[PDB]
Each structure stands twice: as C-alpha cells, then as structure tokens.
Amino acid sequence: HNTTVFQGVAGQSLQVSCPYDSMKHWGRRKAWCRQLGEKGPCQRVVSTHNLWLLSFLRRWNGSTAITDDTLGGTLTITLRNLQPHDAGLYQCQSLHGSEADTLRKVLVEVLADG
C-alpha cells in the first residue's frame, strides 16, 4: 500500500481521485484527512455528506472539496487554489462504524508556475 503522487500548479485546482469497490464500501462514508507524521495524526480536512444517500453533494471545508460516487465507486477530492502549505501526505478513508479503512495514500506536490 505505497503512495500515489498528485502534483498540481500552485494557484489552480488539484483533483485527487480515489477509486474503490462500490460493492465492498456500500453504505460507508468517505473522509479526506491530512497525515502530519508516521505516527499520525490524520486530521480530518473534510468528509462526505452526513447522509450516505447524498454522497454526490459536494461538501466544502475551507479550500478542500469532497464528492463521492457511490454507484460508480469514485471518490473525488478537489484542492481549489493550490498553495505551497498544502503539500504533504494525505489519506482517502472509508468510514464504517468506529474504524476507518485507508483507500489510498496521496502525496500532494506543488509546482511554482512548472
């Protein structure tokens, strides 16, 4: 379960896609947290809609937007207006009850206008 690098030019919107099994994660909410170290924490930046049936509705939180496709099985994260302080390790999480499974490790790179 290694990392996938997503790089985007600073000042533009970065789209991070997280595919998953729509059958396995049926009825599970999704979250996008920022990992600051090897021992955590993965501070939740944004999560999907509180009602899983409305996962298609965009849930904004600062400059990070999240949207989920429960049928097609695709979690889309949007880092609107990239900033150099947004670079780091993140996680795509699938929430079920009290536990949380990791879907994909994402490394956000910021390019200075390459």
Add this chain to the structure above:
Amino acid sequence: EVQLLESGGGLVQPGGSLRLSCAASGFTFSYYYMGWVRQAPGKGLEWVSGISPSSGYTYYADSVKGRFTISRDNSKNTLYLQMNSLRAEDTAVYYCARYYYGYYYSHMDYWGQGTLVTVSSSDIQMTQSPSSLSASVGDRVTITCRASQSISSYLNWYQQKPGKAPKLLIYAASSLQSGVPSRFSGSGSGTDFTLTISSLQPEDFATYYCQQSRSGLHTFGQGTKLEIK
C-alpha cells in the same frame, strides 16, 4: 536503511566558495523536502535553507540570503548548498536533514552527521525560558518554549547529544516520533509549549531545541542545556 552522507567541508578564507554535497539513500529522494541546518561551535542550532522536491521553492534564512544557493538533483539523490562570499559569521557545522512529507507543518526526521566549515584567516522567534537546567536521574524536567506569534500546534523538539547529529523526538506539538521511547511527551498550543520527561535516564543528558513549523523559515530555539545537578 536511510543514510545522509555529507561532504565538501574544510577550511576556507573569507570570501571563498564551498559546495556542500549530501548524498541520500534509502528513501525516494524526489518525494521529500530537504533543508540545511548549521550549528556554530559551542552554540545552538540555526536553520539555514530549504528546497522543494521540484526545486521550484527555495527558502533561505535572512543571514544567508543572497550568498547561499540551495539546489538538488533528484536523478542522483543529492542535495547541494553553494556557499559564496563566506563571511566569518558562517563558521559552523552544517547538517543535512530531510523533511517528512510536506514542508510547512512538517519536521526533520532524518539528519546527516554533519560536515565542518571553518572560515580561517512572517518572521517568528523562539525563546526557551530555561537556558541552563540541571537535574538528576529520575527527576521531573519540563522545558518550555515561547513563540513570537501564533504557530498553532506545529512545533518540534530535537535531542542533540554532544558530538553527534540531532535526533527528532516530538513533532507536531505532541506526536511521538517512531523509535523514541515513551518517556518523552509534548504539549502546548498557540504560543506556549512544554517538553516533559517523566523520569530521566543516563542517555537523556543532552541539549534540547524547539523548532517552529508554520512559516517558511523553520527557526530553531536558543537551546537548553540539561546536565546533572
């Protein structure tokens, strides 16, 4: 395993030029931010420069801006630091350090043993209240660290044994780095932070520094000498 091998140090006259080289192995060098930290002989740590994986972002300190030039070659896994117009103020032991994923809000988890350079013939300050602290084995020591402005909960604590490279203990205000024993603990938010050791050990007698990590200049603290009472 991870190795940060430094080279390119020695003696130089004022106004000379040197090129510090830091060969890296064990980690994907094109993923992490890199940075240089020098330490004057018998003084505290000073953050020098930093660089982005794509080399598009170069952060320099005020004392070395314009004269130093940080660079990297991801194809050869090497970090460079071109030093020009070397004044007598630059006499220090330069350390090569790698940042964990990210730069802002991140921490230096791996350091090089350091190379010696001897010149022969959004600005926040960090102040540690106990400059010289003396305690015995088993005492309860609590070192503090005050910031000039709000730095949220992004502060790091480093332990530097006399004659070796500094090691990372606490990062992100209160997170314990992998490998650090459970005796160390951190706390604090905003502008006041504390480093607490429950019971001291024979290997805990060293120097401890606090480093802020919210702006582009990750300045260190003045230091705290911790020896036997």
